[PDB]
Design a protein around this ligand. Sequence first.
Ligand SMILES: [F-]
Length: 290
Amino acid sequence: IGTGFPFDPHYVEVLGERMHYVDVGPRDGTPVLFLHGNPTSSYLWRNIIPHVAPSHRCIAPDLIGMGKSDKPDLDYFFDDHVRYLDAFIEALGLEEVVLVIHDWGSALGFHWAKRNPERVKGIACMEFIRPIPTWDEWPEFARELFQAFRTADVGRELIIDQNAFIEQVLPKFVVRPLTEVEMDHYREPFLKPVDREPLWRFPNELPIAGEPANIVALVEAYMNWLHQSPVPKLLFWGTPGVLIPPAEAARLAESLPNCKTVDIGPGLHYLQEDNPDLIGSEIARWLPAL
Ligand SMILES: [F-]
């Protein structure tokens, strides 16, 4: 599995801040917009993009405060990310898009799709955010850790001081062993503890047990939209998963209209790190029929 990032950097000004993005592929069709989540960046898509770039433009931004994007003095609530991603999409003058989305990038993508349904031609998704009714629906192997992340003082000490989202959650949520070269890519934006705010705010935004109420409501809303939308959907899943266990992926194959699922094999949360070639090849096979 490749560890390099062989992509020319691009930057665009968004609400007075610079955002980094990958931009490869032909420029005369519907672009494919790749949205990472926590604690990753466009690096997470590095081995998937090459499958799609021969036929389609691939745009992969680094979220505000992440990757090579600028680090404004924000609290980095979900709403902050919504504002910057909305403005990034407009700054590139994108019209219709296909979304490829994961984790908080899926909350962003689904929320954008709900608000701009005529502009979404297809959605490929994996390990995406739904409301989590109770802690029992969070995997036991990561339950105490995420509960700690959401505990006053304790969570900041873990994520801000000890860098636990990078150092603990990444290896925990990839089935295969990650290499040092890969870990160093993921570490690069967060060498300075103060810069880790997004990494801590994100798990504190997860819709778990009805809290925070604003996120639960927003995620319920995009899920009601998704369950009634005719947009083509391609859902990748692994065993045992984290946010989307096998039995749930099988239900969604039916409970989401126009949906196909792809089993990537063993996988936890960062499925892109376990089977990037199957994800990329199957997205490439699915695109032309949109
Ligand atoms: F998170």
